[PDB]
Design a binder for this molecule. Structure first.
Ligand code: SRM
Ligand code: SF4
Ligand code: SO3
Ligand code: CL
Ligand code: CL
Ligand code: K
Length: 538
């Protein structure tokens, strides 16, 4: 490994970090777009204000502005639905640990309410909000409204640090290991430069996903994140062992491996910076299928890569890993849906199921209102695209169970619905091969009408190989494809995955059966359930 491989490939030129002209050969077109103009200048040099003034039809007539809206705007959290909702933008937040407020929730609703049939919102597999319908001339004013309610959307798409995921039961669970809200909160601020923008970590070769583990249940999915913080004592000090490189991609899925490093709790942020700088400095920037952090780790080796993190640390010490973490391997992951006692006596939380994560403006207002009336104005999102409303005086529960909105967003849905996860699909996503959200609900419904079960089978539905709905963690996973019916007609279909496990004994699922027409999945899934999961025919 020639020591010239270890040379930083980016420079801080003019407050922004850019590829050095010697390392700019044979790069992918997303590296070029970033070279041509720095994406952070759209927020940090307020250049959205004037881009927002150009008709969409004009913007498309020159490469430079077409890349503004189709590419660079993703650093502002805005994603052009070019194919399926032309001239409309999806918008994704920073919502560390998935904690929102009623007033944030109400503001998001008032933005999507405006767009009518073209608007709705969604809870994501990184316990985040997305809103849809957004038009460009509205961006400057939405940005201002987001800030006003204490939210940022910065650096949530493209080559950025994505939503910091944490324990959905942080601060409320008797059985928590460590409260992850400070650490995800700190990480988000670091990333976004306390909502101003942070160009030091805004030009990675590829997306990068952190989590901070606080549950024995491992609700955080540490195994599939580029950096996972595993609570662990070392030499009497509380800290985190570090796992690195977990990712999913059309080409390759790989679980996170130990860096062989521990940090004390106060080093969470500087080790995040060190790894990211290493990644940004040294990361490969050709073929996009070969750009995530694991590919660098495989080229340098784990000790190669580790030495590079160590030299970007303060004091340049990176302690070796504590041989055990605080996570109990004896643990049955817990159903958070329903009413549960909090550690603060007299109080309860409620997990409410949100069918495939999909909400309309009216829905968001109802949940905002339950949080205000029954809780403390707080709503928490989950990675299965559900909600928790914490801090409810247990004496209010009886009245809450009677609220009409709880027939739609239930604390006790049938067990297959409890764990159903589906990505956007082709209603809005231009990469999608199939419609996922409506389809998955319809299939799950007909399957559950047929069988009854005790084990909580988790079914994930994803619209294309990008696997945003993470079919490799599911008990039964469905990946969109096109296939053929008995007459050779093109029909939507799914590859069915099995074998995915979560919690400490985590495992990646693989395709069990390819190209099953979607209209044939009910009998197949019914049988799989009966034969493999203890389901009983009704
Ligand atoms: C919304 C969400 C799925 C959802 O219904 O929940 C989704 C959204 C899409 N992802 Fe994802 N990703 C989401 C979960 C993830 C995850 C799960 C996770 O993070 O744990 C995965 C797999 C895990 C991983 O990345 O390590 C993921 C895999 C990707 C990939 C494949 C990555 C790769 O290295 O090849 C793409 C395509 C790409 O990056 O080139 C992508 C790109 C896309 C885009 C941005 C593509 C596009 O612009 O059309 C999707 C936007 C569709 C839309 O309009 O909503 N999305 N995506 C999730 C939003 C997360 C967030 O709030 O930040
Ligand atoms: S898995 Fe594919 S279809 Fe689904 S949201 Fe991600 S990119 Fe779109
Ligand atoms: O956009 S995806 O990477 O969450
Ligand atoms: Cl993106
Ligand atoms: Cl598109
Ligand atoms: K859900």
């Amino acid at each position: 490994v020639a020591a010239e491989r270890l040379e930083p490939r980016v420079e801080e030129k003019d407050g922004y970090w850019i590829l050095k002209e010697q390392f700019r050969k044979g790069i992918n077109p997303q590296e070029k777009v970033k070279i041509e103009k720095e994406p952070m200048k759209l927020f940090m040099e307020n250049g959205i204000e004037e881009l927002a003034k150009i008709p969409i039809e004009e913007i498309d007539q020159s490469k430079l502005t077409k890349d503004d809206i189709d590419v660079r705007l993703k650093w502002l959290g805005l994603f052009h639905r070019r194919k399926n909702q032309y001239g409309r933008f999806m918008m994704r937040l920073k919502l560390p640990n998935g904690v929102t407020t009623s007033a944030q929730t109400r503001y998001l609703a008032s933005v999507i309410r405006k767009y009518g049939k073209e608007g709705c919102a969604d809870i994501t597999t990184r316990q985040n909000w997305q809103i849809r319908g957004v038009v460009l001339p509205d961006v400057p004013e939405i940005l201002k409204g987001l800030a006003e309610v204490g939210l940022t959307s910065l650096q949530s798409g493209m080559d950025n640090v994505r939503n910091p995921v944490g324990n959905p039961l942080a601060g409320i669970d008797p059985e928590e290991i460590v409260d992850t809200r400070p650490y995800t909160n700190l990480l988000s601020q670091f990333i976004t430069g306390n909502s101003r923008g942070n160009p030091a970590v805004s030009n990675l070769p590829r997306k990068w996903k952190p989590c901070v583990v606080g549950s024995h249940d491992l609700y955080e999915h540490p195994h599939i994140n580029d950096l996972a913080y595993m609570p662990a004592t070392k030499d009497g000090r509380f800290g985190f062992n570090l796992l690195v490189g977990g990712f999913f991609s059309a080409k390759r899925c790989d679980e996170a491996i130990p860096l062989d490093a521990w940090v004390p709790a106060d080093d969470v942020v500087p080790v995040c910076r060190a790894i990211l700088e290493a990644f940004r400095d040294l990361g490969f920037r050709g073929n996009r299928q070969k750009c995530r952090m694991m590919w660098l780790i495989d080229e340098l080796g784990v000790e190669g890569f580790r030495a590079e993190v160590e030299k970007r640390m303060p004091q340049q010490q990176l302690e070796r890993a504590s041989p055990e973490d605080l996570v109990q391997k004896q643990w049955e992951r817990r159903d958070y849906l329903g009413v549960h006692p909090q550690k603060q006596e007299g109080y309860s939380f409620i997990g409410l199921h949100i069918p495939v994560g999909r909400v309309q403006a009216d829905d968001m207002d109802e949940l905002a209102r339950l949080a205000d009336e029954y809780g403390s104005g707080e709503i928490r999102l989950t990675v299965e695209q559900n909600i928790i409303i914490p801090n409810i005086e247990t004496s209010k529960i009886e009245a809450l169970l009677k609220e009409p909105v709880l027939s739609t967003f239930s604390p006790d849905p049938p067990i297959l619905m409890k764990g159903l996860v589906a990505c956007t699909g082709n209603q809005f996503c231009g990469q999608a091969i199939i419609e996922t959200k409506a389809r998955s609900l319809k299939i799950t419904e007909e399957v559950q009408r047929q069988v009854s079960l005790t084990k909580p089978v988790r079914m994930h539905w994803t619209g294309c190989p990008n696997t945003c709905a993470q079919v490799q963690v599911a008990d039964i996973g469905f990946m969109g494809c096109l296939t053929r019916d008995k007459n050779g007609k093109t029909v939507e279909g799914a590859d069915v995955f099995l074998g995915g496990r979560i919690g400490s004994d985590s495992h990646l699922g693989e395709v069990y059966k390819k190209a099953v027409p979607c209209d044939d999945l009910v009998p197949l899934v019914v049988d799989l359930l009966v034969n493999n999961f203890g389901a009983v025919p009704r």
